[PDB]
């Protein structure tokens, strides 16, 4: 069963959500929502990971934004809309890996944290792609959703 | 108790009441403030002596066996107005029922039985519901159906808005045995009151009523709406709107279901948005998700009916029975409308 | 004679100016003295004509107008429709009546017609919305009433009747 | 306004000869009009004291202590014991009345030491032993009430209400 | 046990130097657990006042002041004005009572002159307009009760227990 993961979804949803301070941000967030998991879903977990990964510009910032945002909820996401949309998808990736015991949680926030470890990171979701994807489509769906239905239409 | 008085004599009581935790707990609370009895005594005189250290003292007794065991006492007077009331509600529901092309089996003081045509259900409930507790949208037939009492042409006759009122309607087909559906109204009702609690509103706060409910069932699809969402029903004089007001919402949207407002699928598509609805308690964002819900089946753009806030957090805490009933009521509004247009195939 | 003014009390936002003796003579009959509303007429057989409000003349004995009685003439641009009925100040229906009157009044009420070209069906219908009764009390009250907001902290007790003693027939057409 | 000092009835003799005259204030309210005692103010908060006979302060509301309503100047040995107070007359605590009173009066307060440093109870006694229920009368009523002994020689209806009405819990101190 | 001193609760800050010790003995009679104040206490008779803030003598038969229970002094300097006893602990009036008793105490309570100069005017009092209501809360449950408000975080209900018991008169001027 997976009715937790309307919670999740939920949650998540809001801190990407308070996150992206300009709503030019949270249009292109939202078209993320819209076509990523439909990328997933016909093209697989990691190419899709990779393709999201190459577009969030992973930077000291950034990264520093999405800790603090898996931890405070007063963080804000800034820089260029199109990659700080990229980072609030692959922070609602990684939420979810976290609040469901896929990733250890100390594991990635000590990976988004190093350089030499943001490979083995990606390493590691490699060899859990399966389980990932089977997983995490309810989430995903769900968070599409919010998205159609919170954020307006651009 | 305590308002049950007016001008002076209220006083008498609204400090006397009291007097008990509130004060030596004997029969010297009052005598000091029994006074104000004695201030209105000598115009016409007639009592024969003034040394109240009875009345005073029967007055304390009275209430003492009443709020140290909680209960009312019980009057000739209360049991005669009640059956009275009784009588003037089998008038009042003889004529609603016939208002609609309705056919009594057995109006009964506080009981109904009828049959009617799928379309004249909810109206009928909606009405019949708030005219028990005595309310009027309308003369019925030659009774006026005020707020909280049911007048007749200069009678103001007390009606029981106090009372609660449970529901149950079935959809049954023609050729059906009525022992079954007799059997399966009766004990639907008979259970149901007996078993389903809801989200209510006491004091202000949050509570968990357990009757005051509306129960449909088509063949295997129940649903439920209550009918106040508050404790007690109507606490004050124009709470008479509380009443059944999630019956006017299944009205406004049925309504204009099949007006080509809004599409056929509103009912097909709370299954994609019902999850997301229940796992949420800001109610902003239910609100949202629930315009989206009707905005993305609406066959204009244009429409904008939008649901109450209150009718979103509310929980219909059924447990331990083989019956499914949804957990939350929009469902409920979606199902009763489910059931009523399904009720024409 | 004393020519006199009955107000029509329903929840519409048009009685801005329909009263145009405001203080004029000596004694209006709806008086307000530190125990609320009190010598409140209300006349049978009638309601309330929302669309530009008045007392429709109807037949039911069920329907009715719950308006206040003050000395007053309308706009003196009328005298066209409006009811202009005397009686000798005693058949008068009045609800909480501490004293009579001058034994004889003219009375300008606002009066409708049927304007029957539709059903006409009556609505029972109070007064609510707190804000509406507020809006009127600064509309009509503070213009004719002056006794009030001077007199009487006990602001509520003349706000509390009318929510329970205020009603009046709709026609909702 | 006008003084109206308190005084008690006790089984014992305390209350002989304590103020100058036995008018005082220009009109009394206490009178007997052939029905037992009238209009008698009574102190409630206070309590009875039977050893030095005084008032003296307790803190249990259950002390009822009927007495008389005695007016007069205070003898020229108090005031600097005794404390008066001065109010609206809708404040006094009158039981038995026959008609009410509009002037604001200065009730005189007898006062005694609380005893701050003992266990201080009560009993509930009704005046009994009728050696004693003729001779607390001898004392206050024949000179004070001027309407006794010119009014009335039937004291058999007042022989009876001293058993009854003037009811005051014992000490035993 | 301990020389027991009161502390009512005006609708200011007019009773907060009559508490010196502030510990006293060991325990008190009224009971502040988790649930606001049980065995709170209350004189009948007495008004609070706004200027010399103290419980004026009355024989109204409404006036009642209710406060908490402190233990210490007032200054050990007063008592020409202040009234003082001792009573074996069977005439108490516990309102909202919850737990047991005190062991025979003494107690102090505040007390102004009956001042036969003014027209006494006392009205029922509540507590409201709560910002005076926190600062006391801090000052006279919070560096006086060292278990509330180290226990219970709860605010919204102490203070709904606060603003619903504490039912007191006082003149006003
Ligand atoms: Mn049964």
Same mark, same amino acid.
């Given at each position: 069963?997976?009715?937790?993961?309307?919670?999740?979804?939920?949650?998540?949803?809001?801190?990407?959500?308070?996150?992206?301070?300009?709503?030019?941000?949270?249009?292109?967030?939202?078209?993320?929502?819209?076509?990523?998991?439909?990328?997933?879903?016909?093209?697989?977990?990691?190419?899709?990971?990779?393709?999201?990964?190459?577009?969030?510009?992973?930077?000291?910032?950034?990264?520093?934004?999405?800790?603090?945002?898996?931890?405070?909820?007063?963080?804000?996401?800034?820089?260029?809309?199109?990659?700080?949309?990229?980072?609030?998808?692959?922070?609602?990736?990684?939420?979810?890996?976290?609040?469901?015991?896929?990733?250890?949680?100390?594991?990635?926030?000590?990976?988004?944290?190093?350089?030499?470890?943001?490979?083995?990171?990606?390493?590691?979701?490699?060899?859990?792609?399966?389980?990932?994807?089977?997983?995490?489509?309810?989430?995903?769906?769900?968070?599409?959703?919010?998205?159609?239905?919170?954020?307006?239409?651009? | 108790?305590?308002?049950?008085?007016?001008?002076?004599?209220?006083?008498?009581?609204?400090?006397?009441?009291?007097?008990?935790?509130?004060?030596?707990?004997?029969?010297?609370?009052?005598?000091?403030?029994?006074?104000?009895?004695?201030?209105?005594?000598?115009?016409?005189?007639?009592?024969?002596?003034?040394?109240?250290?009875?009345?005073?003292?029967?007055?304390?007794?009275?209430?003492?066996?009443?709020?140290?065991?909680?209960?009312?006492?019980?009057?000739?007077?209360?049991?005669?107005?009640?059956?009275?009331?009784?009588?003037?509600?089998?008038?009042?529901?003889?004529?609603?029922?016939?208002?609609?092309?309705?056919?009594?089996?057995?109006?009964?003081? !506080?009981?109904?039985?009828?049959?009617?045509?799928?379309?004249?259900?909810?109206?009928?409930?909606?009405?019949?519901?708030?005219?028990? &507790?005595?309310?009027?949208?309308? *003369?019925?037939?030659?009774?006026?159906?005020?707020?909280?009492?049911?007048?007749?042409?200069?009678?103001?006759?007390?009606?029981?808005?106090?009372?609660?009122?449970?529901?149950?309607?079935?959809?049954?087909?023609?050729?059906?045995?009525?022992?079954?559906?007799?059997?399966?109204?009766?004990?639907?009702?008979?259970?149901?009151?007996?078993?389903?609690?809801?989200?209510?509103?006491?004091?202000?706060?949050? *509570?968990?009523?357990?009757?005051?409910?509306?129960?449909?069932?088509?063949?295997?699809?129940?649903?439920?709406?209550?009918?106040?969402?508050?404790?007690?029903?109507?606490?004050?004089?124009?709470?008479?709107?509380?009443?059944?007001?999630?019956?006017?919402?299944?009205?406004?949207?049925?309504?204009?279901? !099949?007006?080509?407002?809004?599409?056929?699928?509103?009912?097909? !598509?709370?299954?994609?948005?019902?999850?997301?609805?229940?796992?949420?308690?800001? *109610?902003?964002?239910?609100?949202?998700?629930?315009?989206?819900?009707?905005?993305?089946?609406?066959?204009?753009?244009?429409?904008?009916?939008?649901?109450?806030?209150?009718?979103?957090?509310?929980?219909?805490?059924?447990?331990?029975?083989?019956?499914?009933?949804?957990?939350?009521?929009?469902?409920?509004?979606?199902?009763?409308?489910?059931?009523?247009?399904?009720?024409?195939? | 004679?004393?020519?006199?003014?009955?107000?029509?009390?329903?929840?519409?936002?048009?009685?801005?100016?329909?009263?145009?003796?405001?203080?004029?003579?000596?004694?209006?009959?709806?008086?307000?003295?530190?125990?609320?509303?009190?010598?409140?007429?209300?006349?049978?057989?009638?309601?309330?004509?929302?669309?530009?409000?008045?007392?429709?003349?109807?037949?039911?004995?069920?329907?009715?107008?719950?308006?206040?009685?003050?000395?007053?003439?309308?706009?003196? &641009?009328?005298?066209?429709?409006?009811?202009?009925?005397?009686?000798?100040?005693?058949?008068?229906?009045?609800?909480?009546?501490?004293?009579?009157?001058?034994?004889?009044?003219?009375?300008?009420?606002?009066?409708?017609?049927?304007?029957?070209?539709?059903?006409?069906?009556?609505?029972?219908?109070?007064?609510?919305?707190?804000?509406?009764?507020?809006?009127?009390?600064?509309?009509?009250?503070?213009?004719?009433?002056?006794?009030?907001?001077?007199?009487?902290?006990?602001?509520?007790?003349? *706000?509390?009747?009318?929510?329970?003693?205020?009603?009046?027939?709709?026609?909702?057409?």
């Amino acid at each position: 069963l997976y009715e937790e993961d309307y919670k999740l979804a939920l949650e998540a949803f809001k801190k990407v959500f308070n996150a992206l301070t300009h709503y030019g941000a949270k249009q292109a967030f939202r078209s993320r929502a819209r076509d990523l998991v439909e990328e997933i879903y016909n093209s697989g977990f990691i190419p899709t990971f990779f393709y999201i990964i190459s577009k969030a510009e992973l930077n000291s910032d950034s990264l520093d934004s999405l800790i603090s945002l898996f931890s405070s909820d007063n963080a804000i996401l800034r820089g260029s809309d199109e990659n700080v949309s990229y980072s609030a998808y692959l922070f609602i990736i990684l939420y979810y890996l976290i609040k469901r015991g896929i990733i250890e949680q100390k594991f990635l926030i000590q990976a988004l944290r190093c350089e030499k470890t943001r490979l083995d990171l990606i390493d590691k979701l490699y060899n859990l792609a399966p389980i990932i994807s089977a997983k995490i489509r309810t989430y995903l769906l769900a968070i599409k959703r919010l998205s159609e239905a919170l954020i307006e239409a651009r | 108790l305590v308002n049950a008085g007016s001008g002076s004599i209220v006083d008498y009581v609204k400090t006397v009441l009291k007097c008990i935790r509130e004060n030596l707990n004997k029969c010297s609370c009052a005598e000091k403030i029994y006074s104000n009895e004695v201030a209105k005594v000598m115009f016409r005189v007639n009592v024969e002596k003034a040394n109240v250290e009875e009345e005073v003292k029967n007055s304390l007794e009275y209430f003492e066996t009443i709020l140290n065991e909680g209960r009312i006492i019980v009057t000739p007077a209360w049991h005669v107005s009640i059956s009275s009331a009784l009588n003037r509600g089998l008038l009042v529901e003889l004529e609603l029922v016939n208002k609609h092309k309705g056919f009594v089996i057995y109006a009964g003081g !506080d009981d109904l039985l009828a049959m009617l045509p799928v379309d004249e259900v909810l109206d009928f409930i909606k009405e019949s519901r708030r005219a028990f &507790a005595g309310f009027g949208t309308e *003369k019925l037939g030659n009774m006026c159906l005020e707020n909280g009492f049911v007048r007749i042409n200069n009678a103001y006759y007390p009606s029981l808005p106090i009372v609660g009122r449970s529901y149950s309607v079935i959809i049954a087909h023609y050729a059906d045995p009525l022992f079954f559906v007799i059997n399966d109204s009766y004990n639907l009702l008979e259970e149901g009151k007996e078993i389903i609690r809801y989200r209510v509103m006491y004091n202000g706060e949050y *509570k968990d009523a357990k009757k005051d409910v509306a129960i449909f069932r088509y063949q295997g699809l129940t649903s439920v709406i209550p009918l106040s969402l508050k404790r007690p029903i109507v606490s004050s004089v124009s709470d008479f709107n509380e009443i059944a007001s999630i019956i006017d919402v299944i009205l406004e949207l049925k309504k204009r279901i !099949d007006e080509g407002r809004i599409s056929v699928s509103l009912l097909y !598509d709370y299954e994609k948005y019902k999850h997301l609805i229940v796992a949420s308690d800001e *109610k902003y964002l239910t609100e949202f998700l629930v315009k989206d819900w009707i905005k993305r089946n609406s066959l204009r753009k244009h429409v904008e009916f939008t649901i109450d806030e209150k009718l979103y957090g509310v929980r219909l805490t059924i447990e331990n029975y083989p019956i499914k009933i949804p957990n939350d009521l929009i469902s409920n509004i979606v199902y009763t409308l489910r059931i009523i247009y399904g009720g024409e195939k | 004679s004393t020519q006199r003014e009955y107000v029509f009390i329903p929840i519409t936002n048009s009685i801005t100016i329909d009263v145009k003796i405001t203080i004029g003579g000596s004694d209006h009959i709806t008086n307000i003295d530190e125990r609320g509303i009190h010598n409140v007429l209300v006349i049978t057989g009638y309601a309330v004509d929302e669309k530009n409000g008045r007392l429709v003349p109807t037949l039911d004995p069920c329907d009715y107008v719950k308006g206040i009685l003050v000395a007053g003439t309308p706009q003196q &641009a009328q005298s066209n429709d409006f009811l202009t009925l005397k009686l000798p100040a005693n058949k008068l229906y009045l609800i909480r009546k501490k004293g009579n009157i001058s034994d004889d009044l003219k009375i300008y009420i606002p009066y409708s017609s049927p304007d029957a070209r539709n059903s006409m069906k009556t609505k029972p219908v109070s007064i609510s919305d707190d804000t509406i009764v507020n809006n009127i009390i600064k509309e009509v009250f503070d213009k004719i009433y002056n006794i009030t907001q001077k007199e009487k902290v006990k602001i509520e007790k003349v *706000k509390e009747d009318i929510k329970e003693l205020f009603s009046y027939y709709a026609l909702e057409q």
